[PDB]
Amino acid sequence: GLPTTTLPGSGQFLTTDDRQSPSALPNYEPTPRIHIPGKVHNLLEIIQVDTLIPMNNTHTKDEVNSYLIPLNANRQNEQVFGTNLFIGDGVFKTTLLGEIVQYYTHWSGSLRFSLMYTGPALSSAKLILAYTPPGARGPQDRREAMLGTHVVWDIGLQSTIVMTIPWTSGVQFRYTDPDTYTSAGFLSCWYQTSLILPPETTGQVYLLSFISACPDFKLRLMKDTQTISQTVALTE
């Protein structure tokens, strides 16, 4: 007769507890494993793959056009696009990164922002991508943007530029929650030179934007996402 004393919390059901339990099917032999391609071990692996950002979210309904960033010919200092860096909201909410980030409460690390040109091969352009750390609002002109982290991109044989959004923060982790006071900062693109279209070509050309996490990315405290809901249980 071993003397015992049950502690507070005895008999509770903590959905997060990790204990052993009796098997309802003793001696059962599960089907053997076969080799299946594409094994995933960690969610940090898959967020390193970039997905398209619906940067042009100015439409009344969801469309392919939401992913197309317009580029106009013969314009000098103007802005191409802009966005705050709340990775749990805005244009990022529906991306793979944004979706996985929403399952966690804290984040940290650097982001990978890519831009792919889709205009004619005989066209040219130079753009300046800028990342503005928090403290000063979003840049209102190229001169303001150029003062922060930036990359001058020359469109050529290599169609994609990969700008990085370096982890620039005092506190070592940030909240995934968009209802917070401040985020990673701002992102903007400006005409460094201008888009020059070749003869016999007219109209707008487009940029495609991508987002992914660098190998230094961190995610903590699992939580439920606000991207899915239901009012009644589903039936067959």
């Binding site: 503005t132 928090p134 403290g135 840049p139 003062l147 620039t168 005092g170 506190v171 070592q172």
Partner: protein
């Protein structure tokens, strides 16, 4: 030969000299230092201007009268408009720094009076309206002029020159000296790094402050790491015939200053 009363501090192109000192306090026995790799988070290479910012800056002098209650400065706020340091403060989103504070106040061997010079980390102020009101940026970031507690104090209850910047206006801090502007008692302020300027003994106080924070680096315009307070404990007593006032001067020098996250100038209220 040498004594604790005579000291010289040289930072950059500036030098402080004192012949009536009372040793010098190094907060928690920790000298300032640069952020080591092992504690770093932000990946950007930091900027260390060195001698162009790590030098002595003298603020406007204060007048200590018999009705004085005390003065309060916030760092790095107090130096936000000071030379290259101030400029760097506005262009960067992040920064960290230590300091060497030097409070001055001379008199004669006929004078009496005692000042408490204390450095308080994370000095969260209370609101004048009380209850559930928050202090507005302007009043919590007073600049090089600091906060004059004599505008509405605790001890003898006066209203010196003002009640606040303009007057008792929505969002001002409670100026009760005896309650340290935060609901604690003045006499217990000694648990924080401090020195006394006892007129009969010394005429200066020197405190060296290392970077104190729960994060490796931080926003300098939205956060005040330490608060410097100069409070008269034993009132000023001047000899017969003399002017019943004495000037007090504060000189601060940033140490081991680092800046990071450079972009355009910061947008702050007011």
């Amino acid at each position: 030969g040498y004594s604790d009363r005579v000291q010289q501090i040289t930072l950059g192109n500036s030098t402080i000299t004192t012949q009536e000192a009372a040793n010098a306090v190094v907060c928690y026995a920790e000298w300032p230092e640069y952020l080591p790799d092992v504690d770093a988070s932000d990946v950007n290479k930091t900027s260390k201007p060195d001698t162009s910012v790590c030098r002595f800056y003298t603020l406007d002098s204060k007048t200590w009268t018999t009705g004085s209650k005390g003065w309060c400065w916030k760092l790095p706020d107090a130096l936000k408009d000071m030379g290259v340091f101030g400029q760097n403060m506005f262009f960067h989103s992040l920064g960290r720094s230590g300091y060497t504070v030097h409070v001055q106040c001379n008199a004669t061997k006929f004078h009496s009076g005692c000042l408490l010079v204390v450095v308080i980390p994370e000095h969260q102020l209370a609101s004048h309206e009380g209850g559930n009101v928050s202090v507005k940026y302007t009043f919590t970031h007073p600049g090089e002029r600091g906060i004059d507690l004599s505008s509405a104090a605790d001890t003898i209850g006066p209203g010196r020159a003002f009640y606040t910047t303009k007057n008792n206006e929505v969002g001002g801090p409670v100026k009760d000296v005896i309650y340290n502007m935060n609901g604690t008692l003045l006499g217990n302020l000694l648990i924080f790094p401090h020195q006394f300027i006892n007129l009969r003994t010394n005429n200066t106080a020197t405190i060296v402050i290392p970077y104190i924070n729960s994060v490796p680096i931080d926003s300098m315009t939205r956060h005040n790491n330490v608060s410097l307070m100069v409070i008269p404990i034993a009132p000023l007593t001047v000899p017969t015939g003399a002017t019943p006032s004495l000037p007090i001067t504060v000189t601060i020098a940033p140490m081991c200053t680092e800046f990071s996250g450079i972009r355009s100038k910061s947008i702050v209220p007011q």
